Design a protein around this ligand. Structure first.
Ligand SMILES: C[C@]12CC[C@@H]3c4ccc(O)cc4CC[C@H]3[C@@H]1C[C@@H](O)[C@@H]2O
Ligand SMILES: [Cl-]
Ligand SMILES: [Cl-]
Ligand SMILES: [Cl-]
Ligand SMILES: [Cl-]
Lengths: 244, 11
């Protein structure tokens, strides 16, 4: 139960150390965009990030204390939300653009290359705009990302000791909550402002969930149309949502 | 023990 005995500062340190690297896309500027190639680039990248994400998850305090089957469920539920919040964060400093990778920066018109995608882009762009308005800090972002991992899936658990097991997840979520407040208190926010920013931050997660739900149906539509061949991990990740 | 994700979580 080491995760429940961390100070806020140690919690923050642990999450910062855990952060995965920023990967490059296989984008070739000498290749003219098509629906297939764009979806090819995005899925290839996402497929490479999933591996790093799995390794990041193991470093989130509390996560390794769960059973393997719990760990699988949380990740199956959250993976696209986690990709999206990382994207939105990377993009905060590039208005009107999404920084999928440092060599792959797309605007909304380039999203129109893929059927149904531009509406997802617009929401992702809107979320980064909100992050920029709020002046979201890196220490707040790594708390939010971990909250997404632990929260998405915590209530859809199929079930024993399930109850007792979930109790541990809620204790960690509470620790992350304390850590956020700690951060905000340290930055000089009054009590009132602390509760207000905490709520604003957590209310963004609702939108991130909605975007993930929409993105998931879009990905599934791409698979069905055979637009791009999807990797076996990404397929498994997608199929876990049991769409149509 | 058959899912790819399960395998990668085990390493
Ligand atoms: C799933 C997705 C391709 C991969 C994208 C993707 C790829 C890498 C990454 O780091 C983040 C994202 C977030 C957006 C993802 C797209 C949303 C859908 O409209 C589309 O099918
Ligand atoms: Cl890579
Ligand atoms: Cl085309
Ligand atoms: Cl338009
Ligand atoms: Cl005060």
């Amino acid at each position: 139960s080491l995760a429940l005995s961390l100070t806020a500062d140690q919690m923050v340190s642990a999450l910062l150390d855990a952060e995965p690297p920023i990967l490059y896309s296989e984008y070739d500027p000498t290749r003219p965009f098509s629906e297939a190639s764009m979806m090819g680039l995005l899925t290839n990248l996402a497929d490479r990030e999933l591996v790093h994400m799995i390794n990041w998850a193991k470093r989130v305090p509390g996560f390794v204390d769960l059973t393997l089957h719990d760990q699988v469920h949380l990740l199956e539920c959250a993976w696209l939300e986690i990709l999206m919040i990382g994207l939105v964060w990377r993009s905060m400093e590039h208005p009107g653009k999404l920084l999928f990778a440092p060599n792959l920066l797309l605007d909304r018109n380039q999203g129109k290359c893929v059927e149904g995608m531009v509406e997802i882009f617009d929401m992702l762009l809107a979320t980064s705009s909100r992050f920029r308005m709020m002046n979201l800090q890196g220490e707040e972002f790594v708390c939010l990302k971990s909250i997404i991992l632990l929260n998405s899936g915590v209530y859809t658990f199929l079930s024993l000791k399930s109850l007792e097991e979930k109790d541990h997840i809620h204790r960690v979520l509470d620790k992350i909550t304390d850590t956020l407040i700690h951060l905000m208190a340290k930055a000089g926010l009054t009590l009132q402002q602390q509760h207000q920013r905490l709520a604003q931050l957590l209310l963004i997660l609702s939108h991130i969930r909605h975007m993930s739900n929409k993105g998931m149906e879009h990905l599934y539509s791409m698979k069905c149309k055979n637009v791009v061949p999807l990797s076996d991990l990404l397929l498994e990740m997608l199929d876990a949502h049991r769409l149509h | 023990k058959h899912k790819i994700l399960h395998r990668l979580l085990q390493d």
